[PDB]
Each structure stands twice: as structure tokens, then as C-alpha cells.
Design an enzyme around this catalytic site. Structure first.
Site, PDB file in Angstrom:
ATOM      1  N   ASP A   1     -46.333 -21.005  36.663  1.00  0.00           N
ATOM      2  CA  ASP A   1     -45.354 -20.139  35.981  1.00  0.00           C
ATOM      3  C   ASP A   1     -45.472 -20.088  34.469  1.00  0.00           C
ATOM      4  OD1 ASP A   1     -42.971 -18.574  35.644  1.00  0.00           O
ATOM      5  OD2 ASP A   1     -41.610 -20.242  36.027  1.00  0.00           O
TER       6      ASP A   1
ATOM      7  N   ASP B   1     -44.990 -12.807  32.875  1.00  0.00           N
ATOM      8  CA  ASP B   1     -44.565 -13.880  33.784  1.00  0.00           C
ATOM      9  C   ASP B   1     -45.325 -13.963  35.108  1.00  0.00           C
ATOM     10  OD1 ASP B   1     -43.103 -15.969  34.934  1.00  0.00           O
ATOM     11  OD2 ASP B   1     -41.172 -14.901  34.953  1.00  0.00           O
TER      12      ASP B   1
HETATM   13  C1  LIG Z   1     -45.760 -14.606  41.770  1.00  0.00           C
HETATM   14  O1  LIG Z   1     -45.428 -15.821  42.452  1.00  0.00           O
HETATM   15  C2  LIG Z   1     -44.156 -16.369  42.044  1.00  0.00           C
HETATM   16  C3  LIG Z   1     -43.297 -16.660  43.302  1.00  0.00           C
HETATM   17  C4  LIG Z   1     -42.065 -17.552  42.985  1.00  0.00           C
HETATM   18  C5  LIG Z   1     -40.895 -16.721  42.379  1.00  0.00           C
HETATM   19  C6  LIG Z   1     -39.478 -17.378  42.204  1.00  0.00           C
HETATM   20  C7  LIG Z   1     -38.540 -16.374  41.430  1.00  0.00           C
HETATM   21  N1  LIG Z   1     -38.875 -16.175  40.006  1.00  0.00           N
HETATM   22  C8  LIG Z   1     -38.237 -16.778  38.956  1.00  0.00           C
HETATM   23  O2  LIG Z   1     -37.293 -17.529  39.118  1.00  0.00           O
HETATM   24  C9  LIG Z   1     -38.738 -16.525  37.539  1.00  0.00           C
HETATM   25  C10 LIG Z   1     -39.972 -17.437  37.303  1.00  0.00           C
HETATM   26  N2  LIG Z   1     -40.455 -17.415  35.898  1.00  0.00           N
HETATM   27  C11 LIG Z   1     -39.462 -17.816  34.890  1.00  0.00           C
HETATM   28  C12 LIG Z   1     -38.276 -16.831  34.980  1.00  0.00           C
HETATM   29  N3  LIG Z   1     -37.241 -17.138  34.002  1.00  0.00           N
HETATM   30  S1  LIG Z   1     -36.511 -15.970  33.112  1.00  0.00           S
HETATM   31  O3  LIG Z   1     -36.556 -16.442  31.738  1.00  0.00           O
HETATM   32  O4  LIG Z   1     -37.044 -14.647  33.423  1.00  0.00           O
HETATM   33  C13 LIG Z   1     -34.860 -16.055  33.757  1.00  0.00           C
HETATM   34  C14 LIG Z   1     -34.165 -17.287  33.692  1.00  0.00           C
HETATM   35  C15 LIG Z   1     -32.845 -17.380  34.183  1.00  0.00           C
HETATM   36  C16 LIG Z   1     -32.216 -16.251  34.739  1.00  0.00           C
HETATM   37  C17 LIG Z   1     -30.778 -16.376  35.269  1.00  0.00           C
HETATM   38  C18 LIG Z   1     -32.903 -15.013  34.786  1.00  0.00           C
HETATM   39  C19 LIG Z   1     -34.230 -14.915  34.315  1.00  0.00           C
HETATM   40  C20 LIG Z   1     -37.677 -16.792  36.417  1.00  0.00           C
HETATM   41  C21 LIG Z   1     -39.524 -18.710  41.380  1.00  0.00           C
HETATM   42  C22 LIG Z   1     -40.478 -19.005  40.359  1.00  0.00           C
HETATM   43  C23 LIG Z   1     -40.411 -20.164  39.571  1.00  0.00           C
HETATM   44  C24 LIG Z   1     -39.365 -21.071  39.800  1.00  0.00           C
HETATM   45  C25 LIG Z   1     -38.414 -20.827  40.810  1.00  0.00           C
HETATM   46  C26 LIG Z   1     -38.483 -19.646  41.572  1.00  0.00           C
HETATM   47  O5  LIG Z   1     -37.524 -19.430  42.562  1.00  0.00           O
HETATM   48  C27 LIG Z   1     -37.832 -18.664  43.686  1.00  0.00           C
HETATM   49  C28 LIG Z   1     -37.203 -18.971  44.913  1.00  0.00           C
HETATM   50  C29 LIG Z   1     -37.457 -18.223  46.083  1.00  0.00           C
HETATM   51  C30 LIG Z   1     -38.369 -17.157  46.006  1.00  0.00           C
HETATM   52  C31 LIG Z   1     -39.034 -16.877  44.779  1.00  0.00           C
HETATM   53  C32 LIG Z   1     -38.780 -17.624  43.586  1.00  0.00           C
END
Ligand SMILES: COCCCCC1(CNC(=O)[C@@H]2CNC[C@H](NS(=O)(=O)c3ccc(C)cc3)C2)c2ccccc2Oc2ccccc21
Ligand SMILES: *[C@@H]1O[C@H](CO)[C@@H](O)[C@H](O)[C@H]1NC(C)=O
Length: 335
Positions: A37, A221
């Protein structure tokens, strides 16, 4: 210090929405499926100390410190916030293996992992590819620790995300892979160090710049599944596409997917164009079914946001290089 080493991590593509690779933590290594990430800077995996009342913890690999001879205790409490959910736990240190590179890294053992969204997660944890400025607890990010070893040929890393039975994707540490791109890289300098964020000059739907006319921000991202804008931007964009808003997405009738116009992003010197094939999840062509788009509204809070985010929808067409030496992002057409 620079060496000659490049290292690569083979990625798995889950439904064009999740791209993850493997890392090993501890002695002997305990393997985890992780998301690399650029939108965050913390390394975390679920813990053996997570309560089995958290169903997510029952469904993922857990790090057990009691089975690792290289573990060093820390214990500092830590809460990490993402778009879809929040995790909380405590800090620990151990050896991490990422594609052949072995590095002593401080990471968070997660003890609170909500079923929504973590039950949807095919991956166990996250490896933050961002800068120390975005790191919770001001913990040294893994890439900073890898740079410090003086083994990498250059202070860059590259991403390749394939279109959904071969390679799901690839990360190169210390360079790029020319087998996965065409032409030359076109770079865009970062607005400021600390974030992988660049200036976007405009967004057009068709040929006319209908959005981002006075300029806007673009977070590149790798941990984001989609291309995202603010609730307002996405409302205008979708109105122009003829798409209708549901709870978690926007849809069009499957028959009208191929008729949708191109979407362009003016970044640096060039126009980065996506056709409907690049942004519609074309499951069928039926007049009786609804098809989802790979563009979603996301209100990214300050200081990072309001901002657009260029996730896997964008990276699938454009092979991306992240340059830590020159604070810039390079794009080339993906092969
Ligand atoms: C392309 O492959 C990435 C797949 C993962 C995406 C994904 C979803 N993507 C994410 O969370 C994004 C991953 N990259 C950082 C981003 N932060 S931000 O600054 O844009 C933000 C921060 C807070 C808030 C309230 C809003 C925006 C959020 C994931 C990625 C990183 C960490 C956790 C995570 O959880 C889940 C949980 C379930 C399903 C998908 C995800
Ligand atoms: C935890 O790690 C930090 C560095 O990130 C260090 O300064 C601190 O003393 C550590 N705490 C303990 C209890 O080991």
C-alpha cells in the site's frame, strides 16, 4: 548507499479488486498474504492474541510471537484507519522477508479486526509503502529500512497489476521490469515529500474537461481498488455517464457498458485515457442486468484529502514507478 540488487514479489489478483503478495515474519518464517500500500506507511498482520470473538481473526493467518526466536517485544498501542475499516493492536519487532530481502522491521500485531470489512479480505495484513510522515507511532516504514541496507540498485519500487491463469501482478524493489511496460516513463513530481500525491490538471468525460478544471490532487494508491473522487466529483462524473447510485457503488445496465465514453486524467505533461473496457466490470451485455463501475466516491479526510485516488483501475493500464530518490511518480503503458 546503493548496491546492484533488484528484488521482485509475485502478486495474486483477486477479482480485479485485491492484489496481494507474500511475506514471512519470524524465525522460522510465518507466511502472510499482504497488500503493498502506497497510501499508508504501517506494516500490520492479525495477532495470535486476537480474540476469537473477532470472526475475521478466525478467517486469517495469525502471527504468534511465542513461535518466533527472533521476536523483540515493544507493546506500544496502535490504531490504524483505512477507507473501509479500522484495526487496533500493539507494536512488535521481528525479521521480515520480502522477495529475498531480509529486514528487521517494527510492525503492529492486530487484536481488533472487525468482520466488516475484514471478512471480505482475501489478504491477512498490509505492508505500507508510504513515507514516515504518514506512519502511526512515527515507526520506520519497511522501504526506509530496505534503503538503509544499501543493497538496492536504485531507491525506487514499481507496480504491475494484471487484468484478471498467469501472473496477478508484480512489485520490483530497486527498479522496474521492462517486460511489463511499453514506451518511456513520464514522471510527475510530488507536491511535497511525505505523501505519494501529485497535481492533477483536469478530468475529462469524452473530449471536454468537465471536472478538475481549476486543478486538483491525485493520490497514487496501490492499496486502493478503484479510481476515486469526492462525493461531489463522482456525482457529476456519474451523471455524465448515465450511471445510477446504489449503497456501495454506481451501476449502468450491462447492455450500455460498451457505449460509455472515455475518461482522461491530465497528469504532468500527458493525458491518461481509460475506455469503458478499463472501468466497467463487464459481467454480461444483458438489458436485464446491472454492471458495476471500477470508479467509486471516497471522501478522503484532511490533511491528505479532499483528493482523487488512482488505484488498481488506473495501475492496470499504467505501469507505475515510485521514485524515493527524486520524489516523483513515473507512468508507462502496461504490457
Ligand atoms: C489493490 O489491492 C488493494 C486491496 C485492499 C483494499 C482495502 C481498501 N482500501 C483502503 O482502505 C485504502 C488503502 N490505501 C490507504 C487509503 N487511505 S486514505 O488516506 O485514502 C483514507 C483513510 C481513511 C478514510 C476514512 C478514507 C480514506 C485507504 C485495504 C487496503 C489497505 C488496508 C486495509 C484495507 O481494507 C480493506 C478491507 C476489505 C477489502 C479491501 C480493503
Ligand atoms: C518501541 O519502539 C520505539 C521505536 O519505534 C522505542 O523508542 C520504544 O522505546 C519501544 N518501546 C519498548 C517498550 O520497547
Amino acid at each position: 548507499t546503493l548496491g546492484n540488487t533488484t528484488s521482485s514479489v509475485i502478486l495474486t489478483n483477486y477479482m480485479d479488486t485485491q492484489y496481494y503478495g507474500e511475506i514471512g515474519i519470524g524465525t522460522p518464517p510465518q507466511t502472510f498474504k499482504v497488500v503493498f500500500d502506497t497510501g499508508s506507511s504501517n506494516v500490520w498482520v492479525p495477532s495470535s492474541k486476537c480474540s476469537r470473538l473477532y470472526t475475521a481473526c478466525v478467517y486469517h493467518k495469525l502471527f504468534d510471537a511465542s513461535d518466533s526466536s527472533s521476536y523483540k517485544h515493544n507493546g506500544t498501542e496502535l490504531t490504524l484507519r483505512y477507507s473501509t475499516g479500522t484495526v487496533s493492536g500493539f507494536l512488535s519487532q521481528d525479521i521480515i522477508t520480502v522477495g529475498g530481502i531480509t529486514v528487521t522491521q517494527m510492525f503492529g500485531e492486530v487484536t481488533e479486526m472487525p468482520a466488516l470489512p475484514f471478512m471480505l479480505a482475501e489478504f491477512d495484513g498490509v505492508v505500507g509503502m508510504g513515507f514516515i510522515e504518514q506512519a502511526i507511532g512515527r515507526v520506520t516504514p519497511i522501504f526506509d529500512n530496505i534503503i538503509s541496507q544499501g543493497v538496492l540498485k536504485e531507491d525506487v519500487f514499481s507496480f504491475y497489476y494484471n487484468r484478471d491463469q498467469s501472473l496477478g501482478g508484480q512489485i520490483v524493489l530497486g527498479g522496474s521490469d521492462p517486460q511489463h511496460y511499453e514506451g518511456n516513463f513520464h514522471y510527475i513530481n510530488l507536491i511535497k515529500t511525505g505523501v505519494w500525491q501529485i497535481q492533477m490538471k483536469g478530468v475529462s468525460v469524452g473530449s471536454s474537461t468537465l471536472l478538475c478544471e481549476d486543478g486538483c490532487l491525485a493520490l497514487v494508491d496501490t492499496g486502493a481498488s478503484y479510481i476515486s473522487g469526492s462525493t461531489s466529483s463522482i456525482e457529476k462524473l456519474m451523471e455524465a455517464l448515465g450511471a445510477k447510485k446504489r449503497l456501495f457503488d454506481y451501476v449502468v445496465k450491462c447492455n450500455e457498458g460498451p457505449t460509455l465514453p472515455d475518461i482522461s486524467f491530465h497528469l504532468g505533461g500527458k493525458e491518461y485515457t481509460l475506455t469503458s473496457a478499463d472501468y466497467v466490470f463487464q459481467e454480461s451485455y444483458s438489458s436485464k442486468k446491472l454492471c458495476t463501475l471500477a470508479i467509486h466516491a471516497m471522501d478522503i479526510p484532511p490533511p491528505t484529502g479532499p483528493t482523487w485516488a488512482l488505484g488498481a483501475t488506473f495501475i492496470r493500464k499504467f505501469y507505475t514507478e515510485f521514485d524515493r530518490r527524486n520524489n516523483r511518480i513515473g507512468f508507462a503503458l502496461a504490457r
